Ligand binder design. Structure first.
Ligand SMILES: *[C@@H]1O[C@H](CO)[C@@H](O)[C@H](O)[C@H]1NC(C)=O
Lengths: 49, 31
């Protein structure tokens, strides 16, 4: 009975594309950065861990 | 979605925000 107002944009042609990277992938990147920082300090930014 | 025309002339079609069970006017379902 009530339009959610996303449907009006969709019906008039105003759409939103999804992002390429999912939130799971962003969380995996932050987990990798955090684990590398905790385990190896700053040497993983230069060479190996 | 295509490679270059120097490679091949085979394309794929993505229907944006359309459930595959209502696709008509292989088949994979994405977000
Ligand atoms: C398409 O919509 C129906 C509506 O009930 C849903 O059950 C089905 O899962 C949808 N298709 C996909 C691939 O999710």
């Amino acid at each position: 009975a009530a339009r959610d107002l996303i449907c009006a944009q969709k019906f008039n042609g105003l759409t939103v594309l999804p992002p390429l990277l999912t939130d799971e992938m962003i969380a995996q990147y932050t987990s990798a950065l955090l684990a590398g920082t905790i385990t190896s300090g700053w040497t993983f930014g230069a060479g190996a861990a | 979605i295509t490679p270059g025309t120097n490679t091949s002339n085979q394309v794929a079609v993505l229907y944006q925000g359309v459930n595959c069970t209502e696709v008509p006017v292989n088949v994979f379902q994405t977000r």
